Amino acid sequence: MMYIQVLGSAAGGGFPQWNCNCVNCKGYRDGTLKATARTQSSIALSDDGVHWILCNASPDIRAQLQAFAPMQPARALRDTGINAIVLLDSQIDHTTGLLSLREGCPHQVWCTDMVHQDLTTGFPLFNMLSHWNGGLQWNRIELEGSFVIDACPNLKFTPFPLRSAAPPYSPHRFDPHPGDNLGLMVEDTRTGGKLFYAPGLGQVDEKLLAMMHGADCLLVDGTLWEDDEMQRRGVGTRTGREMGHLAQNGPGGTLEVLDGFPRQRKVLIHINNTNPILDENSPERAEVLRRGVEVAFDGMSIELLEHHH
Amino acid sequence: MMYIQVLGSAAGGGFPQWNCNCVNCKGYRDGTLKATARTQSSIALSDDGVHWILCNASPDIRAQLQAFAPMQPARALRDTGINAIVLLDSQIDHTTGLLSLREGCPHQVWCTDMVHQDLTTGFPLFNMLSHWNGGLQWNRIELEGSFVIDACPNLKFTPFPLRSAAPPYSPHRFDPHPGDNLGLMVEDTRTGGKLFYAPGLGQVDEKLLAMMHGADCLLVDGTLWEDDEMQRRGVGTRTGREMGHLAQNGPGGTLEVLDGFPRQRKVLIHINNTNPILDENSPERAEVLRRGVEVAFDGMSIELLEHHH
Numbered sequence A, B: 001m002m003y004i005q006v007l008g009s010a011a012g013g014g015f016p017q018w019n020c021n022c023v024n025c026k027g028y029r030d031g032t033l034k035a036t037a038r039t040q041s042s043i044a045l046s047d048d049g050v051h052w053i054l055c056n057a058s059p060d061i062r063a064q065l066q067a068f069a070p071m072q073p074a075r076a077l078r079d080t081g082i083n084a085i086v087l088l089d090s091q092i093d094h095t096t097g098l099l100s101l102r103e104g105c106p107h108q109v110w111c112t113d114m115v116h117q118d119l120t121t122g123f124p125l126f127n128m129l130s131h132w133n134g135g136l137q138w139n140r141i142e143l144e145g146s147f148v149i150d151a152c153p154n155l156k157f158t159p160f161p162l163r164s165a166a167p168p169y170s171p172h173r174f175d176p177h178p179g180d181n182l183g184l185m186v187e188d189t190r191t192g193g194k195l196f197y198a199p200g201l202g203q204v205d206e207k208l209l210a211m212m213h214g215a216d217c218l219l220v221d222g223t224l225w226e227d228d229e230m231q232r233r234g235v236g237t238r239t240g241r242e243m244g245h246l247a248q249n250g251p252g253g254t255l256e257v258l259d260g261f262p263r264q265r266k267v268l269i270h271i272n273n274t275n276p277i278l279d280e281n282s283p284e285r286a287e288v289l290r291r292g293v294e295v296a297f298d299g300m301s302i303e304l305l306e307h308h309h
Protein backbone atom coordinates (compact mmCIF):
# COMPACT_ATOMS: atom_id res chain seq x y z
CA MET A 1 0.00 0.00 0.00
CA MET A 2 1.26 3.43 -1.10
CA TYR A 3 -0.33 6.39 0.66
CA ILE A 4 -0.55 9.64 -1.29
CA GLN A 5 -1.75 12.71 0.60
CA VAL A 6 -2.59 15.91 -1.27
CA LEU A 7 -1.36 18.67 1.02
CA GLY A 8 -1.94 21.38 -1.54
CA SER A 9 -3.69 21.24 -4.87
CA ALA A 10 -3.44 24.78 -6.33
CA ALA A 11 -0.98 26.34 -8.75
CA GLY A 12 1.33 29.16 -7.67
CA GLY A 13 -0.56 31.78 -5.69
CA GLY A 14 -3.03 29.29 -4.28
CA PHE A 15 -6.79 29.80 -4.32
CA PRO A 16 -7.92 32.50 -3.69
CA GLN A 17 -4.73 34.29 -4.68
CA TRP A 18 -3.81 37.16 -2.36
CA ASN A 19 -3.88 39.95 -4.97
CA CYS A 20 -6.46 38.47 -7.35
CA ASN A 21 -10.07 39.50 -7.95
CA CYS A 22 -10.85 37.32 -10.95
CA VAL A 23 -14.28 35.73 -11.25
CA ASN A 24 -13.21 32.79 -9.07
CA CYS A 25 -11.25 34.61 -6.36
CA LYS A 26 -13.82 37.40 -5.94
CA GLY A 27 -16.67 34.88 -6.11
CA TYR A 28 -15.03 32.87 -3.34
CA ARG A 29 -14.54 35.90 -1.09
CA ASP A 30 -18.15 37.04 -1.82
CA GLY A 31 -19.69 33.73 -0.77
CA THR A 32 -21.41 33.66 -4.16
CA LEU A 33 -19.27 30.85 -5.58
CA LYS A 34 -19.28 27.17 -4.60
CA ALA A 35 -15.56 26.48 -4.38
CA THR A 36 -13.03 25.28 -1.82
CA ALA A 37 -9.87 27.21 -0.92
CA ARG A 38 -6.60 25.52 -1.88
CA THR A 39 -2.99 25.87 -0.80
CA GLN A 40 -0.02 25.58 -3.14
CA SER A 41 0.85 22.23 -4.78
CA SER A 42 2.52 19.63 -2.55
CA ILE A 43 2.00 15.94 -1.83
CA ALA A 44 3.27 13.55 0.82
CA LEU A 45 4.09 9.89 0.16
CA SER A 46 4.36 6.91 2.48
CA ASP A 47 4.67 3.13 2.38
CA ASP A 48 3.47 2.64 5.96
CA GLY A 49 1.45 5.70 7.04
CA VAL A 50 4.03 6.74 9.64
CA HIS A 51 7.13 7.84 7.70
CA TRP A 52 6.44 10.46 5.02
CA ILE A 53 8.28 11.92 2.05
CA LEU A 54 7.32 15.46 1.17
CA CYS A 55 7.31 16.28 -2.54
CA ASN A 56 7.95 19.99 -2.87
CA ALA A 57 7.93 22.29 0.18
CA SER A 58 5.33 24.93 -0.46
CA PRO A 59 5.03 28.41 1.12
CA ASP A 60 1.82 27.11 2.74
CA ILE A 61 3.65 24.26 4.49
CA ARG A 62 2.78 25.28 8.07
CA ALA A 63 -0.99 25.12 7.44
CA GLN A 64 -0.54 22.02 5.28
CA LEU A 65 1.27 20.03 7.97
CA GLN A 66 -1.16 21.15 10.64
CA ALA A 67 -4.14 19.87 8.62
CA PHE A 68 -2.74 16.33 8.24
CA ALA A 69 -2.43 14.56 11.61
CA PRO A 70 0.27 12.00 10.65
CA MET A 71 2.59 14.95 10.15
CA GLN A 72 2.69 15.19 13.98
CA PRO A 73 3.05 11.65 15.41
CA ALA A 74 3.87 13.19 18.81
CA ARG A 75 6.43 10.48 19.70
CA ALA A 76 8.64 13.04 21.47
CA LEU A 77 8.59 16.67 22.66
CA ARG A 78 10.10 17.46 19.26
CA ASP A 79 8.83 15.37 16.37
CA THR A 80 7.58 15.36 12.79
CA GLY A 81 6.23 12.86 10.28
CA ILE A 82 8.51 14.30 7.56
CA ASN A 83 11.43 11.94 6.97
CA ALA A 84 12.67 13.39 3.66
CA ILE A 85 11.87 16.06 1.08
CA VAL A 86 12.09 15.60 -2.68
CA LEU A 87 12.32 18.70 -4.89
CA LEU A 88 11.19 18.49 -8.53
CA ASP A 89 12.57 21.91 -9.46
CA SER A 90 13.95 25.05 -7.83
CA GLN A 91 10.91 27.33 -8.13
CA ILE A 92 10.09 29.56 -5.16
CA ASP A 93 6.69 27.96 -4.76
CA HIS A 94 8.24 24.51 -4.43
CA THR A 95 11.12 25.32 -2.14
CA THR A 96 10.23 28.24 0.16
CA GLY A 97 8.60 25.93 2.69
CA LEU A 98 12.05 24.62 3.63
CA LEU A 99 12.67 27.90 5.48
CA SER A 100 9.73 27.05 7.74
CA LEU A 101 11.29 23.67 8.63
CA ARG A 102 14.59 25.01 9.87
CA GLU A 103 13.77 24.36 13.52
CA GLY A 104 13.81 20.63 12.63
CA CYS A 105 17.17 20.33 10.86
CA PRO A 106 18.84 18.17 9.77
CA HIS A 107 16.60 17.25 6.83
CA GLN A 108 17.39 14.85 4.02
CA VAL A 109 16.69 16.71 0.77
CA TRP A 110 16.72 15.02 -2.61
CA CYS A 111 17.24 17.14 -5.71
CA THR A 112 19.21 17.25 -8.93
CA ASP A 113 22.59 18.87 -9.33
CA MET A 114 20.95 21.73 -11.27
CA VAL A 115 18.43 22.43 -8.53
CA HIS A 116 21.14 22.17 -5.88
CA GLN A 117 23.13 24.75 -7.88
CA ASP A 118 20.17 27.13 -7.84
CA LEU A 119 19.60 26.51 -4.12
CA THR A 120 23.22 27.31 -3.30
CA THR A 121 23.38 30.47 -5.34
CA GLY A 122 20.38 32.45 -6.53
CA PHE A 123 18.10 31.19 -3.74
CA PRO A 124 20.74 29.93 -1.31
CA LEU A 125 18.54 27.85 0.98
CA PHE A 126 21.26 25.25 1.54
CA ASN A 127 23.74 27.95 2.59
CA MET A 128 21.24 29.74 4.81
CA LEU A 129 19.94 26.70 6.58
CA SER A 130 23.38 25.23 7.17
CA HIS A 131 23.50 27.46 10.27
CA TRP A 132 20.53 25.59 11.77
CA ASN A 133 21.97 22.37 13.23
CA GLY A 134 23.61 21.05 10.07
CA GLY A 135 20.84 22.29 7.79
CA LEU A 136 19.77 20.41 4.68
CA GLN A 137 21.65 17.28 3.77
CA TRP A 138 21.81 16.99 0.00
CA ASN A 139 21.06 13.69 -1.72
CA ARG A 140 21.71 13.93 -5.44
CA ILE A 141 19.01 12.86 -7.84
CA GLU A 142 20.85 11.44 -10.88
CA LEU A 143 19.46 12.06 -14.37
CA GLU A 144 19.07 8.37 -15.03
CA GLY A 145 18.09 5.43 -12.84
CA SER A 146 16.11 5.27 -9.61
CA PHE A 147 16.50 6.00 -5.91
CA VAL A 148 15.12 4.75 -2.64
CA ILE A 149 14.74 6.83 0.52
CA ASP A 150 15.65 4.74 3.60
CA ALA A 151 12.64 5.79 5.69
CA CYS A 152 10.24 4.35 3.09
CA PRO A 153 12.22 1.38 1.80
CA ASN A 154 9.36 0.06 -0.34
CA LEU A 155 9.01 3.18 -2.50
CA LYS A 156 11.18 3.22 -5.61
CA PHE A 157 11.50 6.66 -7.23
CA THR A 158 12.28 6.94 -10.94
CA PRO A 159 12.39 10.57 -12.12
CA PHE A 160 11.76 11.46 -15.77
CA PRO A 161 13.00 14.60 -17.51
CA LEU A 162 10.73 17.52 -18.39
CA ARG A 163 11.53 20.53 -20.58
CA SER A 164 14.04 22.68 -18.74
CA ALA A 165 12.77 26.01 -17.47
CA ALA A 166 14.90 27.40 -14.63
CA PRO A 167 13.15 30.03 -12.45
CA PRO A 168 13.59 33.75 -13.05
CA TYR A 169 16.07 34.14 -10.28
CA SER A 170 18.31 31.39 -11.58
CA PRO A 171 21.87 32.17 -12.74
CA HIS A 172 20.97 30.00 -15.73
CA ARG A 173 17.33 30.97 -16.60
CA PHE A 174 18.57 32.04 -20.03
CA ASP A 175 20.60 28.83 -20.28
CA PRO A 176 18.37 25.83 -19.42
CA HIS A 177 19.97 22.51 -18.48
CA PRO A 178 18.83 18.90 -18.10
CA GLY A 179 17.88 18.37 -14.46
CA ASP A 180 16.15 21.75 -14.06
CA ASN A 181 12.76 20.00 -14.11
CA LEU A 182 11.49 16.53 -13.56
CA GLY A 183 8.44 14.42 -12.94
CA LEU A 184 8.27 11.28 -10.80
CA MET A 185 7.27 7.70 -11.20
CA VAL A 186 6.92 6.08 -7.77
CA GLU A 187 6.54 2.34 -7.36
CA ASP A 188 5.49 0.34 -4.30
CA THR A 189 7.89 -2.53 -4.81
CA ARG A 190 5.74 -4.81 -2.64
CA THR A 191 2.79 -4.67 -5.05
CA GLY A 192 4.04 -3.09 -8.27
CA GLY A 193 1.56 -0.26 -7.76
CA LYS A 194 2.79 2.84 -9.63
CA LEU A 195 2.10 6.57 -9.36
CA PHE A 196 2.84 8.90 -12.30
CA TYR A 197 3.30 12.41 -10.83
CA ALA A 198 3.65 15.36 -13.23
CA PRO A 199 2.21 18.52 -11.65
CA GLY A 200 3.94 20.57 -14.35
CA LEU A 201 3.48 19.14 -17.81
CA GLY A 202 3.87 21.30 -20.91
CA GLN A 203 4.35 18.65 -23.60
CA VAL A 204 3.91 14.90 -24.05
CA ASP A 205 6.00 12.59 -26.25
CA GLU A 206 5.72 8.93 -27.18
CA LYS A 207 8.11 7.75 -24.46
CA LEU A 208 6.13 9.69 -21.85
CA LEU A 209 2.84 8.09 -22.96
CA ALA A 210 4.50 4.68 -22.85
CA MET A 211 5.61 5.09 -19.26
CA MET A 212 2.17 6.48 -18.30
CA HIS A 213 0.55 3.28 -19.53
CA GLY A 214 2.61 1.35 -17.04
CA ALA A 215 1.25 3.46 -14.19
CA ASP A 216 -1.86 2.84 -12.07
CA CYS A 217 -2.59 6.41 -11.03
CA LEU A 218 -1.92 9.55 -13.10
CA LEU A 219 -1.60 12.74 -11.04
CA VAL A 220 -1.05 15.49 -13.59
CA ASP A 221 -1.00 19.22 -14.34
CA GLY A 222 -4.41 20.78 -14.11
CA THR A 223 -3.38 24.43 -14.22
CA LEU A 224 -5.55 25.99 -16.95
CA TRP A 225 -8.77 24.99 -18.69
CA GLU A 226 -7.83 26.92 -21.84
CA ASP A 227 -4.41 28.07 -23.01
CA ASP A 228 -5.53 31.72 -22.92
CA GLU A 229 -7.20 31.49 -19.53
CA MET A 230 -5.10 34.23 -17.93
CA GLN A 231 -6.17 36.77 -20.55
CA ARG A 232 -9.80 35.64 -20.59
CA ARG A 233 -9.96 36.36 -16.85
CA GLY A 234 -7.99 39.58 -17.34
CA VAL A 235 -5.30 38.83 -14.75
CA GLY A 236 -2.26 37.94 -16.85
CA THR A 237 -0.74 38.15 -20.32
CA ARG A 238 1.27 34.92 -20.38
CA THR A 239 -0.19 31.89 -22.16
CA GLY A 240 -0.38 28.25 -21.09
CA ARG A 241 2.39 27.05 -23.41
CA GLU A 242 4.44 30.08 -22.37
CA MET A 243 4.25 28.91 -18.74
CA GLY A 244 4.93 25.27 -19.58
CA HIS A 245 1.38 24.01 -18.98
CA LEU A 246 -0.85 21.96 -21.26
CA ALA A 247 -4.45 23.13 -20.79
CA GLN A 248 -7.25 20.59 -20.24
CA ASN A 249 -9.22 21.63 -23.29
CA GLY A 250 -8.41 21.86 -27.00
CA PRO A 251 -6.29 19.87 -29.48
CA GLY A 252 -3.40 18.27 -27.63
CA GLY A 253 -4.98 19.17 -24.30
CA THR A 254 -4.59 16.95 -21.25
CA LEU A 255 -8.20 15.75 -21.45
CA GLU A 256 -7.48 14.57 -24.98
CA VAL A 257 -4.29 12.84 -23.74
CA LEU A 258 -6.13 11.22 -20.80
CA ASP A 259 -8.69 9.73 -23.19
CA GLY A 260 -6.07 7.10 -24.01
CA PHE A 261 -5.86 5.93 -20.39
CA PRO A 262 -9.27 4.43 -19.54
CA ARG A 263 -8.09 2.10 -16.76
CA GLN A 264 -5.78 4.47 -14.87
CA ARG A 265 -7.03 6.56 -12.01
CA LYS A 266 -6.78 10.14 -13.30
CA VAL A 267 -6.45 13.22 -11.10
CA LEU A 268 -5.81 16.85 -11.98
CA ILE A 269 -3.58 18.75 -9.56
CA HIS A 270 -1.78 22.14 -9.51
CA ILE A 271 -4.95 24.02 -10.46
CA ASN A 272 -4.79 27.80 -11.11
CA ASN A 273 -7.10 30.17 -9.26
CA THR A 274 -8.57 31.16 -12.67
CA ASN A 275 -9.57 27.63 -13.64
CA PRO A 276 -13.35 27.12 -13.92
CA ILE A 277 -13.05 23.50 -12.77
CA LEU A 278 -12.63 25.02 -9.31
CA ASP A 279 -16.26 26.13 -9.60
CA GLU A 280 -18.14 23.08 -8.39
CA ASN A 281 -21.15 24.21 -10.44
CA SER A 282 -19.32 24.78 -13.72
CA PRO A 283 -19.96 22.79 -16.91
CA GLU A 284 -16.16 22.51 -17.12
CA ARG A 285 -16.08 20.60 -13.82
CA ALA A 286 -18.99 18.51 -15.08
CA GLU A 287 -17.05 17.59 -18.23
CA VAL A 288 -14.01 16.54 -16.22
CA LEU A 289 -16.16 14.22 -14.09
CA ARG A 290 -17.88 12.87 -17.20
CA ARG A 291 -14.44 11.89 -18.54
CA GLY A 292 -13.64 9.91 -15.37
CA VAL A 293 -11.09 12.52 -14.28
CA GLU A 294 -10.92 13.84 -10.68
CA VAL A 295 -10.09 17.33 -9.45
CA ALA A 296 -7.64 17.28 -6.54
CA PHE A 297 -8.51 19.15 -3.37
CA ASP A 298 -6.54 19.84 -0.21
CA GLY A 299 -6.73 16.84 2.08
CA MET A 300 -7.46 14.33 -0.69
CA SER A 301 -6.19 10.83 0.14
CA ILE A 302 -5.21 8.43 -2.60
CA GLU A 303 -4.39 4.83 -1.77
CA LEU A 304 -2.53 2.70 -4.29
CA LEU A 305 -3.33 -0.88 -3.41
CA GLU A 306 -1.97 -2.85 -6.35
CA HIS A 307 -0.91 -2.96 -9.99
CA HIS A 308 -3.49 -3.39 -12.79
CA HIS A 309 -1.35 -6.10 -14.35
CA MET B 1 -7.22 57.84 13.99
CA MET B 2 -4.44 55.26 13.66
CA TYR B 3 -5.56 51.73 12.86
CA ILE B 4 -3.38 48.89 14.11
CA GLN B 5 -4.26 45.38 12.96
CA VAL B 6 -2.58 42.36 14.53
CA LEU B 7 -2.10 39.95 11.64
CA GLY B 8 0.01 37.57 13.67
CA SER B 9 0.72 37.49 17.36
CA ALA B 10 3.04 34.49 17.91
CA ALA B 11 6.82 34.24 18.14
CA GLY B 12 8.83 32.33 15.54
CA GLY B 13 7.23 28.97 14.79
CA GLY B 14 3.73 30.21 15.48
CA PHE B 15 1.24 28.39 17.71
CA PRO B 16 1.04 25.40 17.55
CA GLN B 17 4.55 25.03 16.19
CA TRP B 18 4.84 22.41 13.44
CA ASN B 19 7.36 20.13 15.19
CA CYS B 20 6.43 20.88 18.81
CA ASN B 21 4.59 18.71 21.33
CA CYS B 22 5.05 20.82 24.43
CA VAL B 23 2.22 21.09 26.94
CA ASN B 24 0.61 23.92 24.94
CA CYS B 25 1.03 22.60 21.40
CA LYS B 26 -0.06 19.05 22.27
CA GLY B 27 -2.89 20.37 24.43
CA TYR B 28 -4.10 22.46 21.52
CA ARG B 29 -4.03 19.56 19.07
CA ASP B 30 -5.75 17.30 21.67
CA GLY B 31 -8.67 19.67 22.19
CA THR B 32 -7.87 19.55 25.90
CA LEU B 33 -6.50 23.10 26.09
CA LYS B 34 -8.43 26.37 25.79
CA ALA B 35 -6.16 28.32 23.46
CA THR B 36 -6.33 30.01 20.07
CA ALA B 37 -3.93 29.25 17.21
CA ARG B 38 -1.62 32.11 16.22
CA THR B 39 0.43 32.94 13.15
CA GLN B 40 3.85 34.58 13.24
CA SER B 41 4.25 38.20 14.43
CA SER B 42 3.16 40.92 12.00
CA ILE B 43 1.04 44.05 12.20
CA ALA B 44 -0.52 46.38 9.66
CA LEU B 45 -0.85 50.15 10.15
CA SER B 46 -3.13 52.71 8.53
CA ASP B 47 -4.20 56.32 8.91
CA ASP B 48 -7.39 55.90 6.86
CA GLY B 49 -8.38 52.20 6.84
CA VAL B 50 -7.73 51.84 3.11
CA HIS B 51 -3.96 52.18 2.63
CA TRP B 52 -1.89 49.85 4.82
CA ILE B 53 1.73 49.53 5.87
CA LEU B 54 2.85 46.03 6.71
CA CYS B 55 5.37 45.74 9.53
CA ASN B 56 7.35 42.58 8.94
CA ALA B 57 6.33 40.06 6.25
CA SER B 58 5.82 36.76 7.99
CA PRO B 59 5.90 33.24 6.49
CA ASP B 60 2.17 33.08 7.30
CA ILE B 61 1.40 36.15 5.18
CA ARG B 62 -1.01 34.45 2.75
CA ALA B 63 -3.38 33.32 5.54
CA GLN B 64 -2.87 36.62 7.36
CA LEU B 65 -3.91 38.77 4.40
CA GLN B 66 -6.85 36.52 3.63
CA ALA B 67 -8.22 36.89 7.17
CA PHE B 68 -8.27 40.71 7.08
CA ALA B 69 -10.71 42.04 4.46
CA PRO B 70 -9.13 45.49 3.91
CA MET B 71 -6.11 43.66 2.53
CA GLN B 72 -8.26 42.99 -0.57
CA PRO B 73 -10.14 46.22 -1.47
CA ALA B 74 -11.05 44.66 -4.84
CA ARG B 75 -10.73 47.97 -6.74
CA ALA B 76 -9.31 46.18 -9.79
CA LEU B 77 -8.75 42.65 -11.15
CA ARG B 78 -5.35 42.89 -9.48
CA ASP B 79 -5.26 44.74 -6.18
CA THR B 80 -4.00 44.75 -2.60
CA GLY B 81 -4.35 46.89 0.50
CA ILE B 82 -0.57 46.72 1.10
CA ASN B 83 1.02 50.03 0.10
CA ALA B 84 4.42 49.56 1.78
CA ILE B 85 6.36 47.12 3.95
CA VAL B 86 8.62 48.11 6.84
CA LEU B 87 11.23 45.60 8.06
CA LEU B 88 12.54 45.84 11.64
CA ASP B 89 15.31 43.29 11.10
CA SER B 90 16.44 40.68 8.59
CA GLN B 91 15.28 37.52 10.37
CA ILE B 92 13.70 34.79 8.25
CA ASP B 93 10.46 34.99 10.18
CA HIS B 94 10.13 38.70 9.42
CA THR B 95 11.10 38.70 5.77
CA THR B 96 10.13 35.39 4.13
CA GLY B 97 6.61 36.62 3.41
CA LEU B 98 8.03 38.95 0.76
CA LEU B 99 8.54 35.91 -1.49
CA SER B 100 4.78 35.35 -1.40
CA LEU B 101 4.14 38.92 -2.61
CA ARG B 102 6.22 38.71 -5.74
CA GLU B 103 3.21 38.55 -8.04
CA GLY B 104 2.44 42.13 -6.89
CA CYS B 105 5.79 43.84 -7.49
CA PRO B 106 6.86 46.58 -7.36
CA HIS B 107 6.70 46.99 -3.57
CA GLN B 108 8.09 49.85 -1.54
CA VAL B 109 10.22 48.29 1.21
CA TRP B 110 11.67 50.30 4.08
CA CYS B 111 14.66 48.91 5.94
CA THR B 112 18.05 49.93 7.28
CA ASP B 113 21.28 49.69 5.35
CA MET B 114 22.31 46.71 7.51
CA VAL B 115 19.12 44.81 6.77
CA HIS B 116 19.35 45.68 3.09
CA GLN B 117 22.91 44.27 3.14
CA ASP B 118 21.63 41.00 4.59
CA LEU B 119 18.76 40.90 2.08
CA THR B 120 21.14 41.35 -0.84
CA THR B 121 23.61 38.75 0.26
CA GLY B 122 22.90 35.98 2.76
CA PHE B 123 19.15 35.98 2.10
CA PRO B 124 19.11 37.79 -1.25
CA LEU B 125 15.41 38.63 -1.47
CA PHE B 126 16.08 41.94 -3.22
CA ASN B 127 18.19 40.21 -5.88
CA MET B 128 15.71 37.37 -6.35
CA LEU B 129 12.63 39.49 -6.58
CA SER B 130 14.20 42.01 -8.94
CA HIS B 131 13.22 39.60 -11.73
CA TRP B 132 9.52 40.08 -10.89
CA ASN B 133 8.51 43.38 -12.50
CA GLY B 134 11.11 45.59 -10.83
CA GLY B 135 10.95 43.73 -7.52
CA LEU B 136 11.39 45.48 -4.18
CA GLN B 137 12.15 49.17 -4.20
CA TRP B 138 14.44 49.97 -1.29
CA ASN B 139 13.75 52.97 0.93
CA ARG B 140 16.54 53.45 3.44
CA ILE B 141 15.67 53.78 7.10
CA GLU B 142 18.30 56.13 8.56
CA LEU B 143 19.64 55.50 12.07
CA GLU B 144 18.43 58.86 13.29
CA GLY B 145 15.36 60.95 12.53
CA SER B 146 11.94 59.97 11.19
CA PHE B 147 10.26 58.97 7.95
CA VAL B 148 6.86 59.22 6.36
CA ILE B 149 5.43 56.75 3.84
CA ASP B 150 3.47 58.63 1.13
CA ALA B 151 0.45 56.31 1.16
CA CYS B 152 -0.22 57.11 4.83
CA PRO B 153 0.90 60.72 5.03
CA ASN B 154 -0.32 61.20 8.60
CA LEU B 155 1.85 58.45 10.13
CA LYS B 156 5.29 59.59 11.27
CA PHE B 157 7.72 56.74 11.91
CA THR B 158 10.62 57.22 14.34
CA PRO B 159 12.71 54.05 14.75
CA PHE B 160 14.78 53.46 17.89
CA PRO B 161 17.84 51.23 18.12
CA LEU B 162 17.80 47.82 19.81
CA ARG B 163 20.77 45.60 20.67
CA SER B 164 22.22 44.29 17.44
CA ALA B 165 21.75 40.59 16.78
CA ALA B 166 22.06 39.71 13.09
CA PRO B 167 20.45 36.37 12.09
CA PRO B 168 22.45 33.17 11.83
CA TYR B 169 22.70 33.35 8.10
CA SER B 170 24.09 36.86 8.12
CA PRO B 171 27.60 37.57 6.80
CA HIS B 172 27.98 39.63 9.97
CA ARG B 173 26.26 37.54 12.72
CA PHE B 174 29.59 37.42 14.55
CA ASP B 175 30.04 41.16 13.92
CA PRO B 176 26.86 43.02 14.97
CA HIS B 177 26.23 46.54 13.69
CA PRO B 178 23.89 49.42 14.52
CA GLY B 179 20.83 49.11 12.29
CA ASP B 180 20.58 45.31 12.60
CA ASN B 181 17.56 45.72 14.90
CA LEU B 182 15.08 48.40 15.67
CA GLY B 183 11.77 49.18 17.28
CA LEU B 184 9.23 51.75 16.10
CA MET B 185 7.47 54.75 17.46
CA VAL B 186 4.57 55.69 15.18
CA GLU B 187 2.71 58.96 15.55
CA ASP B 188 -0.60 60.04 14.02
CA THR B 189 0.39 63.62 13.35
CA ARG B 190 -3.27 64.68 13.22
CA THR B 191 -3.87 63.79 16.88
CA GLY B 192 -0.47 63.20 18.46
CA GLY B 193 -1.53 59.62 19.20
CA LYS B 194 1.59 57.43 19.54
CA LEU B 195 2.27 53.70 19.27
CA PHE B 196 5.40 52.18 20.84
CA TYR B 197 6.11 48.92 18.97
CA ALA B 198 8.87 46.62 20.28
CA PRO B 199 8.02 42.98 19.50
CA GLY B 200 11.62 42.05 20.32
CA LEU B 201 12.87 43.65 23.51
CA GLY B 202 15.79 42.19 25.45
CA GLN B 203 16.79 45.14 27.61
CA VAL B 204 15.40 48.51 28.71
CA ASP B 205 17.38 51.68 29.47
CA GLU B 206 16.43 55.07 30.84
CA LYS B 207 16.08 56.68 27.40
CA LEU B 208 13.79 53.84 26.29
CA LEU B 209 11.54 54.28 29.35
CA ALA B 210 11.42 58.02 28.70
CA MET B 211 10.21 57.58 25.15
CA MET B 212 7.67 54.94 26.28
CA HIS B 213 6.11 57.47 28.64
CA GLY B 214 5.38 59.68 25.68
CA ALA B 215 3.46 56.88 23.98
CA ASP B 216 -0.25 56.07 24.26
CA CYS B 217 -0.12 52.38 23.43
CA LEU B 218 2.73 49.98 24.26
CA LEU B 219 2.87 46.88 22.04
CA VAL B 220 5.78 44.86 23.37
CA ASP B 221 7.61 41.52 23.47
CA GLY B 222 5.60 38.82 25.14
CA THR B 223 7.71 35.83 24.14
CA LEU B 224 8.37 33.95 27.40
CA TRP B 225 6.76 33.95 30.84
CA GLU B 226 10.03 32.90 32.51
CA ASP B 227 13.58 33.21 31.23
CA ASP B 228 14.04 29.42 31.37
CA GLU B 229 10.72 28.60 29.74
CA MET B 230 12.25 26.62 26.86
CA GLN B 231 13.97 24.23 29.25
CA ARG B 232 11.00 23.96 31.62
CA ARG B 233 8.90 22.77 28.68
CA GLY B 234 11.75 20.56 27.46
CA VAL B 235 11.84 21.90 23.90
CA GLY B 236 14.95 24.08 23.83
CA THR B 237 18.20 24.87 25.63
CA ARG B 238 18.51 28.59 24.87
CA THR B 239 17.45 31.09 27.53
CA GLY B 240 15.36 34.25 27.27
CA ARG B 241 18.30 36.65 27.58
CA GLU B 242 20.22 34.45 25.14
CA MET B 243 17.48 35.01 22.55
CA GLY B 244 17.17 38.72 23.26
CA HIS B 245 13.83 38.53 25.08
CA LEU B 246 12.87 39.91 28.48
CA ALA B 247 10.44 37.48 30.13
CA GLN B 248 7.21 38.75 31.70
CA ASN B 249 8.00 37.47 35.17
CA GLY B 250 10.90 38.01 37.57
CA PRO B 251 13.19 40.93 38.50
CA GLY B 252 13.56 43.22 35.51
CA GLY B 253 10.75 41.40 33.71
CA THR B 254 8.39 43.20 31.35
CA LEU B 255 5.51 43.04 33.84
CA GLU B 256 7.72 44.84 36.34
CA VAL B 257 8.63 47.42 33.66
CA LEU B 258 4.97 47.89 32.65
CA ASP B 259 4.04 48.65 36.27
CA GLY B 260 5.46 52.13 35.67
CA PHE B 261 3.01 52.82 32.84
CA PRO B 262 -0.47 52.88 34.41
CA ARG B 263 -2.14 55.11 31.81
CA GLN B 264 -0.78 53.51 28.62
CA ARG B 265 -2.64 50.77 26.86
CA LYS B 266 -0.40 47.71 27.28
CA VAL B 267 -0.38 44.70 24.94
CA LEU B 268 1.90 41.68 24.80
CA ILE B 269 2.73 40.42 21.31
CA HIS B 270 5.20 37.93 19.75
CA ILE B 271 4.18 35.17 22.18
CA ASN B 272 6.04 31.82 22.11
CA ASN B 273 4.14 28.56 21.75
CA THR B 274 5.49 27.55 25.19
CA ASN B 275 4.10 30.58 27.01
CA PRO B 276 1.40 29.72 29.57
CA ILE B 277 -0.39 33.04 28.94
CA LEU B 278 -1.63 31.34 25.77
CA ASP B 279 -3.64 29.05 28.05
CA GLU B 280 -6.80 31.04 28.60
CA ASN B 281 -7.31 29.17 31.90
CA SER B 282 -3.82 29.71 33.30
CA PRO B 283 -3.08 31.73 36.45
CA GLU B 284 -0.34 33.38 34.37
CA ARG B 285 -2.96 34.76 31.96
CA ALA B 286 -5.03 35.80 34.97
CA GLU B 287 -2.08 37.75 36.40
CA VAL B 288 -1.50 39.56 33.12
CA LEU B 289 -5.14 40.67 33.02
CA ARG B 290 -4.98 41.69 36.69
CA ARG B 291 -2.08 44.00 35.79
CA GLY B 292 -4.12 45.72 33.06
CA VAL B 293 -2.03 44.08 30.34
CA GLU B 294 -3.60 42.47 27.24
CA VAL B 295 -2.49 39.38 25.32
CA ALA B 296 -2.51 39.94 21.56
CA PHE B 297 -4.38 37.50 19.34
CA ASP B 298 -4.63 37.17 15.58
CA GLY B 299 -7.22 39.59 14.27
CA MET B 300 -6.97 42.00 17.21
CA SER B 301 -7.83 45.58 16.23
CA ILE B 302 -6.34 48.51 18.11
CA GLU B 303 -7.55 52.01 17.42
CA LEU B 304 -5.47 54.98 18.55
CA LEU B 305 -7.86 57.89 18.79
CA GLU B 306 -5.83 60.57 20.54
CA HIS B 307 -2.92 61.51 22.78
CA HIS B 308 -3.23 61.34 26.60
CA HIS B 309 -1.73 64.81 26.89
Ligand SMILES: [Zn+2]
Pocket: A016, A017, A020, A021, A022, A023, A024, A025, A026, A273, A274
Ligand atom coordinates in the same frame (compact mmCIF):
# COMPACT_ATOMS: atom_id res chain seq x y z
ZN1 LIG C 1 -8.19 34.71 -9.18
Ligand SMILES: [Zn+2]
Pocket: B016, B017, B020, B021, B022, B023, B024, B025, B026, B273, B274
Ligand atom coordinates in the same frame (compact mmCIF):
# COMPACT_ATOMS: atom_id res chain seq x y z
ZN1 LIG D 1 4.95 23.96 21.76
